[PDB]
Amino acid sequence: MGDTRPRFLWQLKFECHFFNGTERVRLLERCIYNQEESVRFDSDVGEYRAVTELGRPDAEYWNSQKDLLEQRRAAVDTYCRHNYGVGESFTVQRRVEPKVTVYPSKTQPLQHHNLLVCSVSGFYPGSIEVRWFRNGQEEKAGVVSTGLIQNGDWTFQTLVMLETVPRSGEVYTCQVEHPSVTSPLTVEWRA
Amino acid sequence: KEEHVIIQAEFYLNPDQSGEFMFDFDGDEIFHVDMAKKETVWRLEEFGRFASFEAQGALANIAVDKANLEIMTKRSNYTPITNVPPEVTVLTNSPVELREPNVLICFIDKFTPPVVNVTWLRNGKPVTTGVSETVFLPREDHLFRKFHYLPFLPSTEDVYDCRVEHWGLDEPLLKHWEFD
Amino acid sequence: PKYVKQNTLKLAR
Structure with a gap:
């Protein structure tokens, strides 16, 4: 310049x-x-x-x-x-409800492992809690969060990822709590 | 344990002769005053249907701010700002699906002074259709942040870059994005 | 509903 x-x-x-x-x-x-x-x-x-x-x-x-x-x-x-x-x-x-989606990552670094992504987008205000559960039990290890991302337009997003080694029959749940909803939002992935 | 913060943030920069006046709520812009058009610009259109702000008050403050900058420049014996280069990130605003409209965000953070050059490139060529951007937003460490936006249709054949130049950088910074 | 600004003061000369 x-x-x-x-x-x-x-x-x-x-x-x-x-x-x-x-x-x-x-x-x-x-x-x-x-x-x-x-x-x-x-x-x-x-x-x-x-x-x-x-x-x-x-x-x-x-x-x-x-x-x-x-x-x-x-x-x-x-x-x-x-x-x-x-x-x-x-x-x-102002209260804008998150859109929550779960998907396996397009790139899978490890065989027999499935990196799952919980995408929480479009919400306001920034205060939010996002948890992963395996068969109803909260995963307190192995979870990565991007943290809170302010988009600059009065909305936020966050991505929370879980490395699983899943077995058929297992049920993984991403759960989102946010002031825009009275009960937690949940999206399930069935292995 | 605060719940909320409203900031009226202003700046003047020489020798660029650039000023800014904005209000922020919890880190999001409510409005700024367009210095050239001399009008209030609401960050979300509907805010202008809910509230008002007399833009000429911002212009009066900015004139005072220019004169005060000159005073401080002399009082500091002409100590100039140290450039701090930006950190740049590119992300979409929602998960990408082929042929489903989305928005690329170029987040330019932690820099000063508040002068930057930003270009969106698609397949290496500048793209401007539908792009928008914010003014310079304040940070608690007194650096700045800024956002640029590019609506797009995801495709396997397009790649994108946010090209950023700033005085604290010795070369242009190109932050890449492509459909994964 | 009108936002009000704080006036900027002249610095000491």
């Missing part, structure tokens, strides 16, 4: 952290130069604090401005709780 001129980056992050609905709220305003946070306002502290030397003059200056501090102190209500209410019904309350 060329153009190796030096670059200089300034980032601001106003973070509203919500605990138990909006029972407890913490506002953390952060200023970041390049990759280093320089100064922050933490509503649990109630005034600006420098994080590095570069942020010292800003915290000193902003802390001398009474109206500024009063607005920042009330922002847990006028900003965080306000914005939480604006979007609650389509963010906090």
Whole structure:
């Protein structure tokens, strides 16, 4: 790509952290130069604090401005709780059910073994639990999970794989628990 | 033990003269402001039927952010950013079935500064039909992530690559995908 | 329902 001129980056992050609905709220305003946070306002502290030397003059200056501090102190209500209410019904309350499929892997590394894949896709929110069972008994060894993959479009996916050495008659179950369903989803593979 | 986090994230980058303003909820974008068209762009279309945001407020913040960047550049005695190159992964959004529409996702993660060149290639040739992408999304370590998307019809005869260039890389990174 | 922003402050000069 060329153009190796030096670059200089300034980032601001106003973070509203919500605990138990909006029972407890913490506002953390952060200023970041390049990759280093320089100064922050933490509503649990109630005034600006420098994080590095570069942020010292800003915290000193902003802390001398009474109206500024009063607005920042009330922002847990006028900003965080306000914005939480604006979007609650389509963010906090968004629930999209996973699509769950089970299939043997197209590539089978070992003879007499069957790598099974449980694909859990399209869901929201990210909190999910995916388990494998063999004849009804949970497999707590031999399981590989890709972990939670955020797709960038308000959906997630995950893949959970089990190496079996199956016998005819055995029944393997992938079980998914997620806030969008009241009972676990299960998909079975019969060896 | 937090349940949720909403972040208003902004940046300005020189000498590119590039700014961004977005809101994030639990790591997903709610909206950003298009700096050129000067309008609010909702990440899912329906959000614009449920809420509003005055885009001119973002432009006013960005002007302040540009001026502040200049202040910090001088205050740091012109210390520039250290490039951090991205990690790139390509995956589909659902299990692949022959001739069943799907989407390829190119996930570009853990990089800074927020300037990248991304191209989808099919059989080595650039493809743009139906592609889309996100703006630069924040990370807790202050690096960035980004997603590019390519709807496609799986086939045994096509292979794909996500080609990514960034200042922290000395050569283009080509992340490959083909029907298994 | 309108999202509200926090205003960015001018740094010390």
